[PDB]
Amino acid sequence: MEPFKQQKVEDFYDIGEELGSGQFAIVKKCREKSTGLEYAAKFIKKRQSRASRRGVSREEIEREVSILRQVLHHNVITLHDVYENRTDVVLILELVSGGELFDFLAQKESLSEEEATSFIKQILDGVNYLHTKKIAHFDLKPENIMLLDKNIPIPHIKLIDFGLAHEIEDGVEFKNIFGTPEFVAPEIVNYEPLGLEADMWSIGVITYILLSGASPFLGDTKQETLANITSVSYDFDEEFFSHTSELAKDFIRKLLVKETRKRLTIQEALRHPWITPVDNQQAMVRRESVVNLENFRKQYV
Ligand SMILES: NCCNS(=O)(=O)c1cccc2cnccc12
């Protein structure tokens, strides 16, 4: 098991602007002095003991690193190196400086469902690689779908933040409560057995929001949000879904299913007609169907 470098990160990197933060990790933009190449440095604060309200445990850091070290894919963030001092364990990761997918979408003059499925298909490709390796992401949500270079015509998506990711064991049961309520599967809220299926639910939510601007199960309070999810109470309200094709809806509807066995696995979602058209007729429908960008820009900004 590769050991973490014990040197001071600042002796090897020039630390720069803050890229983001969140709970127990601050991500700063850095540059290695020897090579001159740029990266992003994720400082994870370690726990003091175990009750300790501040910090992440050793296991959960070692899990994340273990998982990150396995993954080399074009739609997934790649690890460069790991450092450690007395307070923080610092992950030096690929620099993805294109911002969030949704921020880029929110600036477009127009967006067809074909253009939409391009970006969704990248997310699917990435999740397929993970799932083939029996790795659940468990935190798929818009702010975790980043872009490399927004200045190109079709930006390239990179999945980030594997802090809740987990290797799925055959025969072993895994239950936990985590994630952002708005995007979590029913099995998470119910504290029922989890697996690869939860990611597919969250792709459903992501697609629902991407096409419409509205969130499927979001309530006025966390309570309401959780009750909507558990009953699977959403609709395709024509105020948001008048421009939306039947196939787009079929896709979302087969993902947002309570029964984990009946939900689409990743390989099925890649092969869905909305992602992979079977004839040239349905390819035209997708190219002609538009997304309502103002509904989207309103619920974003
Ligand atoms: N707490 C999440 C902070 N998100 S973030 O700073 O944008 C961010 C998080 C993780 C990896 C990144 C790689 N490159 C740029 C930014 C990155």
Coordinates of C-alpha atoms and ligand atoms in Angstrom, one line a residue:
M1 CA 0.0 0.0 0.0
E2 CA 1.7 3.2 -1.3
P3 CA 2.6 5.6 1.6
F4 CA 1.7 9.2 1.8
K5 CA 4.6 11.7 1.3
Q6 CA 5.5 13.3 4.7
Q7 CA 7.2 16.4 3.3
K8 CA 5.6 19.8 3.5
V9 CA 3.5 20.3 0.4
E10 CA 4.5 24.0 0.2
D11 CA 8.2 23.0 -0.2
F12 CA 7.2 21.3 -3.5
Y13 CA 4.1 23.3 -4.7
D14 CA 3.2 27.0 -5.1
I15 CA -0.2 27.2 -3.5
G16 CA -2.6 29.7 -5.2
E17 CA -6.3 30.7 -5.4
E18 CA -9.1 28.9 -3.6
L19 CA -11.1 26.8 -6.0
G20 CA -13.7 25.6 -3.6
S21 CA -14.5 24.4 0.0
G22 CA -17.0 22.2 1.8
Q23 CA -17.4 20.8 5.3
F24 CA -14.0 19.1 5.9
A25 CA -12.0 19.9 2.7
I26 CA -10.6 23.1 1.1
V27 CA -9.4 22.8 -2.5
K28 CA -6.7 25.2 -3.6
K29 CA -5.1 25.7 -7.0
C30 CA -1.4 24.6 -7.0
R31 CA 1.6 24.2 -9.3
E32 CA 4.5 21.7 -8.8
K33 CA 7.8 23.6 -8.6
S34 CA 9.9 20.9 -10.3
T35 CA 7.6 20.2 -13.4
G36 CA 5.8 23.6 -13.5
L37 CA 2.5 21.8 -14.3
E38 CA -0.7 22.9 -12.6
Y39 CA -2.9 20.8 -10.3
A40 CA -5.7 21.2 -7.6
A41 CA -4.7 20.5 -4.0
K42 CA -7.5 19.1 -1.8
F43 CA -6.7 19.6 1.9
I44 CA -8.7 17.1 4.0
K45 CA -8.8 17.9 7.7
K46 CA -8.1 14.8 9.8
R47 CA -10.1 13.9 13.0
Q48 CA -8.6 14.5 16.4
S49 CA -9.8 11.1 17.8
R50 CA -13.2 9.5 17.0
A51 CA -16.0 11.4 18.7
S52 CA -14.3 14.5 17.3
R53 CA -16.9 16.6 15.5
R54 CA -14.2 18.0 13.2
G55 CA -12.3 16.0 10.6
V56 CA -12.5 12.9 8.4
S57 CA -11.3 9.5 9.7
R58 CA -8.2 7.7 8.6
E59 CA -10.3 4.9 7.0
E60 CA -12.5 7.2 5.0
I61 CA -9.4 9.1 3.6
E62 CA -7.6 5.8 2.9
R63 CA -10.8 4.5 1.1
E64 CA -11.0 7.6 -1.1
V65 CA -7.3 7.5 -2.0
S66 CA -7.5 3.7 -2.6
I67 CA -10.4 4.3 -5.0
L68 CA -8.9 7.3 -6.7
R69 CA -5.6 5.4 -7.3
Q70 CA -7.5 2.7 -9.4
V71 CA -9.3 5.1 -11.7
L72 CA -7.8 6.2 -15.1
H73 CA -10.6 7.5 -17.3
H74 CA -11.2 10.6 -19.5
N75 CA -14.5 11.4 -17.7
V76 CA -13.1 10.9 -14.2
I77 CA -10.6 13.1 -12.2
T78 CA -7.2 11.5 -11.9
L79 CA -4.9 11.5 -8.9
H80 CA -1.3 12.8 -9.1
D81 CA 0.1 12.5 -5.6
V82 CA -0.7 12.3 -1.9
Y83 CA 0.9 14.3 0.9
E84 CA 0.4 14.4 4.7
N85 CA 1.2 16.5 7.7
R86 CA 0.0 16.5 11.3
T87 CA -3.4 18.2 10.6
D88 CA -4.3 17.6 6.9
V89 CA -4.0 14.8 4.3
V90 CA -3.5 16.7 1.0
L91 CA -4.7 15.1 -2.3
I92 CA -3.0 16.6 -5.4
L93 CA -5.5 16.0 -8.2
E94 CA -5.9 16.9 -11.9
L95 CA -6.8 20.6 -12.3
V96 CA -10.3 20.8 -13.8
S97 CA -10.8 24.5 -14.4
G98 CA -13.9 24.6 -16.6
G99 CA -16.3 25.1 -13.7
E100 CA -19.6 23.2 -13.4
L101 CA -21.5 21.7 -16.4
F102 CA -24.7 23.6 -15.5
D103 CA -22.8 27.0 -15.3
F104 CA -21.6 26.5 -18.9
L105 CA -25.1 25.3 -20.1
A106 CA -26.7 28.4 -18.4
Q107 CA -24.8 30.7 -20.9
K108 CA -25.8 29.0 -24.1
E109 CA -28.1 30.7 -26.7
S110 CA -29.8 27.3 -27.3
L111 CA -29.5 23.6 -26.5
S112 CA -30.9 20.6 -28.3
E113 CA -31.6 17.2 -26.7
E114 CA -28.8 15.9 -29.0
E115 CA -26.4 18.4 -27.4
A116 CA -27.9 17.5 -24.0
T117 CA -27.4 13.7 -24.5
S118 CA -23.7 14.3 -25.5
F119 CA -23.0 15.7 -22.0
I120 CA -25.2 13.1 -20.3
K121 CA -23.5 10.3 -22.3
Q122 CA -20.1 11.5 -21.1
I123 CA -21.4 11.2 -17.5
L124 CA -22.7 7.7 -18.3
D125 CA -19.4 6.7 -19.9
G126 CA -17.6 7.8 -16.7
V127 CA -20.1 6.0 -14.4
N128 CA -19.9 2.8 -16.5
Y129 CA -16.1 2.7 -16.0
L130 CA -16.6 3.0 -12.3
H131 CA -19.5 0.5 -12.2
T132 CA -17.5 -2.1 -14.3
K133 CA -14.9 -1.8 -11.5
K134 CA -17.7 -2.2 -8.8
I135 CA -17.3 1.4 -7.6
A136 CA -20.4 3.3 -6.6
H137 CA -19.9 7.1 -6.6
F138 CA -22.7 7.9 -4.2
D139 CA -22.5 11.6 -4.7
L140 CA -23.6 12.3 -8.3
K141 CA -25.0 15.8 -8.5
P142 CA -24.6 18.9 -10.8
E143 CA -21.8 20.6 -8.7
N144 CA -19.8 17.3 -9.0
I145 CA -20.0 17.3 -12.9
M146 CA -17.2 19.7 -13.9
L147 CA -15.7 20.7 -17.3
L148 CA -12.1 20.8 -18.5
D149 CA -12.1 23.7 -21.0
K150 CA -15.3 25.6 -21.5
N151 CA -13.8 27.6 -24.4
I152 CA -14.2 24.6 -26.8
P153 CA -17.4 23.8 -28.6
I154 CA -18.3 20.6 -26.7
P155 CA -16.5 20.7 -23.3
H156 CA -15.3 17.4 -21.7
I157 CA -16.9 16.3 -18.5
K158 CA -15.0 15.1 -15.5
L159 CA -16.6 13.5 -12.4
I160 CA -15.0 14.7 -9.1
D161 CA -15.2 14.2 -5.3
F162 CA -15.1 10.5 -4.5
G163 CA -15.5 11.2 -0.8
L164 CA -18.5 9.0 -0.5
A165 CA -17.5 6.4 -3.1
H166 CA -17.4 2.7 -2.1
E167 CA -16.3 -0.6 -3.5
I168 CA -19.4 -2.9 -3.8
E169 CA -18.8 -6.3 -2.3
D170 CA -20.6 -9.4 -3.6
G171 CA -22.8 -10.8 -0.8
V172 CA -21.9 -8.1 1.7
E173 CA -24.7 -5.7 2.9
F174 CA -24.0 -2.0 2.9
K175 CA -26.4 0.6 4.5
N176 CA -25.7 4.2 5.2
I177 CA -27.1 7.8 5.2
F178 CA -25.2 10.4 3.3
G179 CA -25.3 12.8 0.3
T180 CA -27.5 15.8 -0.6
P181 CA -31.2 15.0 0.1
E182 CA -32.3 16.4 -3.3
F183 CA -30.3 13.9 -5.2
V184 CA -30.3 10.7 -3.1
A185 CA -32.1 7.4 -3.9
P186 CA -35.0 6.0 -1.8
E187 CA -32.8 3.2 -0.5
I188 CA -30.5 5.8 1.1
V189 CA -33.4 7.7 2.9
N190 CA -35.1 4.4 3.9
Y191 CA -31.8 3.0 5.3
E192 CA -32.3 0.0 3.0
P193 CA -29.4 -2.0 1.3
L194 CA -27.4 0.1 -1.1
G195 CA -25.4 -0.7 -4.2
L196 CA -24.6 0.5 -7.8
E197 CA -28.3 1.3 -8.3
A198 CA -28.2 4.6 -6.3
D199 CA -26.0 6.3 -8.9
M200 CA -28.6 5.5 -11.6
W201 CA -31.3 7.2 -9.6
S202 CA -29.1 10.3 -9.3
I203 CA -28.5 10.4 -13.0
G204 CA -32.3 10.5 -13.3
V205 CA -32.4 13.6 -11.1
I206 CA -29.5 15.2 -13.0
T207 CA -31.2 14.6 -16.3
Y208 CA -34.6 15.8 -15.0
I209 CA -33.0 19.1 -13.9
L210 CA -30.8 19.4 -17.0
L211 CA -33.8 19.2 -19.3
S212 CA -36.3 21.3 -17.3
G213 CA -34.8 23.6 -14.7
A214 CA -37.0 22.1 -11.9
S215 CA -35.8 19.4 -9.4
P216 CA -38.0 16.3 -9.3
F217 CA -38.4 15.7 -5.6
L218 CA -37.3 19.0 -4.0
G219 CA -39.7 20.3 -1.3
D220 CA -39.8 23.5 0.7
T221 CA -38.1 21.7 3.6
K222 CA -35.8 18.7 4.0
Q223 CA -38.8 16.8 5.4
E224 CA -40.9 17.4 2.3
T225 CA -37.9 16.5 0.0
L226 CA -37.5 13.2 1.8
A227 CA -41.2 12.3 1.7
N228 CA -41.3 13.0 -2.1
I229 CA -38.4 10.7 -2.7
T230 CA -39.7 7.8 -0.6
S231 CA -43.1 7.9 -2.3
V232 CA -41.5 8.6 -5.7
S233 CA -43.8 11.6 -6.1
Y234 CA -42.9 13.7 -9.2
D235 CA -44.4 14.7 -12.5
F236 CA -43.5 16.1 -15.9
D237 CA -45.5 19.3 -15.4
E238 CA -46.1 20.8 -18.8
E239 CA -44.9 24.2 -17.5
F240 CA -41.4 22.8 -17.8
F241 CA -41.8 19.7 -20.1
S242 CA -43.7 21.0 -23.1
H243 CA -40.5 21.0 -25.3
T244 CA -39.4 17.6 -24.0
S245 CA -39.6 14.4 -26.1
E246 CA -41.3 11.2 -25.0
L247 CA -38.0 9.3 -25.1
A248 CA -36.3 11.8 -22.8
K249 CA -39.2 11.2 -20.4
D250 CA -39.0 7.5 -20.9
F251 CA -35.3 7.6 -19.9
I252 CA -35.9 9.6 -16.8
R253 CA -39.0 7.5 -15.8
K254 CA -37.1 4.2 -16.0
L255 CA -34.3 5.6 -13.7
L256 CA -36.5 7.2 -11.0
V257 CA -37.9 3.8 -9.8
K258 CA -38.1 2.7 -6.2
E259 CA -37.4 -1.0 -6.8
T260 CA -33.6 -1.3 -7.2
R261 CA -33.8 -4.5 -9.3
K262 CA -36.2 -2.9 -11.8
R263 CA -34.2 0.3 -12.1
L264 CA -31.9 0.7 -15.1
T265 CA -28.4 -0.4 -14.7
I266 CA -25.7 1.7 -16.4
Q267 CA -25.3 -0.6 -19.4
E268 CA -29.1 -0.3 -20.1
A269 CA -29.1 3.5 -19.8
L270 CA -26.2 3.7 -22.4
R271 CA -28.3 1.6 -24.7
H272 CA -31.6 3.6 -24.2
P273 CA -33.0 4.9 -27.5
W274 CA -32.7 8.5 -26.2
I275 CA -28.9 8.0 -25.7
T276 CA -28.4 5.6 -28.5
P277 CA -31.0 6.0 -31.3
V278 CA -31.9 2.9 -33.3
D279 CA -33.0 4.5 -36.6
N280 CA -32.5 7.8 -38.3
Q281 CA -36.0 8.9 -37.6
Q282 CA -35.5 9.1 -33.8
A283 CA -32.1 10.8 -34.3
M284 CA -33.9 13.7 -36.0
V285 CA -36.5 14.0 -33.2
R286 CA -33.7 14.4 -30.6
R287 CA -31.9 16.9 -32.7
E288 CA -35.1 19.0 -33.1
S289 CA -36.3 18.8 -29.5
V290 CA -35.1 21.8 -27.6
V291 CA -34.4 22.5 -23.9
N292 CA -36.1 25.5 -22.2
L293 CA -33.0 27.5 -21.2
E294 CA -34.9 30.3 -19.5
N295 CA -36.6 27.8 -17.1
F296 CA -33.1 26.5 -16.5
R297 CA -31.4 29.9 -16.2
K298 CA -34.2 31.0 -13.7
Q299 CA -33.7 28.0 -11.4
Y300 CA -29.9 28.7 -11.6
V301 CA -28.4 32.1 -12.4
Ligands
LIG1 N1 -15.8 21.0 -1.9 C1 -15.8 20.9 -3.4 C2 -15.0 22.0 -4.0 N2 -15.0 21.9 -5.5 S1 -13.8 22.3 -6.4 O1 -12.9 23.3 -5.7 O2 -14.4 23.0 -7.6 C3 -13.0 21.0 -6.9 C4 -13.1 19.9 -6.2 C5 -12.4 18.7 -6.5 C6 -11.5 18.7 -7.5 C7 -11.3 19.8 -8.3 C8 -10.3 19.8 -9.3 N3 -10.1 20.9 -10.1 C9 -10.8 22.1 -9.8 C10 -11.7 22.2 -8.8 C11 -12.0 21.1 -8.0

